[PDB]
Structures are given as structure tokens and as C-alpha cells.
poneritoxin (Anochetus emarginatus), 16 residues
Amino acid sequence: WCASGCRKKRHGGCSC
């Protein structure tokens, strides 16, 4: 789960 339903990444962050 990421902010604003963003996409997860290998680094662990979220892509928006």
C-alpha cells in the first residue's frame, strides 16, 4: 500500500 494508492517500488518508496 502506498500514498494515494501509488505504485510500490523495489526501493520501497512510492511512485506518483
In short: The radius of gyration is 6 Å.
